[PDB]
Amino acid sequence: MTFITKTPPAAVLLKKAAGIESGSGEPNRNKVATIKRDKVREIAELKMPDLNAASIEAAMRMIEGTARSMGIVVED
């Protein structure tokens, strides 16, 4: 009665926000993959009610370990 509610994992949209696709190594002007906390958490917010998270500490949490051990870092 409320339609369907399908949502992807945070390990797929997270990196997307950053932009890590491919790099020859270090071309002209290169920036590391750093995702501020106001941004990485921003995505975890859009998918807060899509991961059974009782709060942000539970959502942003998945965006941390996922946006950290995958190579992407986070700033705050």
Question: φ and ψ at 68, to 5 degrees?
Answer: -140, -55
Q: Which amino acid is at 68?
A: R
> Which of 69, 61, 59 shows the shortest CA–CA distance to 7?
59
DSSP for the chain reads ---------HHHHHHHHHT-S---S--SS----EEEHHHHHHHHHHTSTTTT-SSHHHHHHHHHHHHHHTS-EEE-
Q: How many CB atoms lie within 10 A of CB 58?
A: 13
8: its two tokens: 């992807």
Q: Which amino acid is at 55?
A: S
49: its two tokens: 């009610």
Domains of the chain: 1-76 (1.10.10.250)
Whether residue 5 contacts residue 47, with contact meaning beta carbons closer than 8 Å, is answered with no
Q: How was this structure determined?
A: NMR
Q: How many CB atoms lie within 10 A of CB 51?
A: 15
Q: Residue 51's Cα: distance from chain center in Å?
A: 13
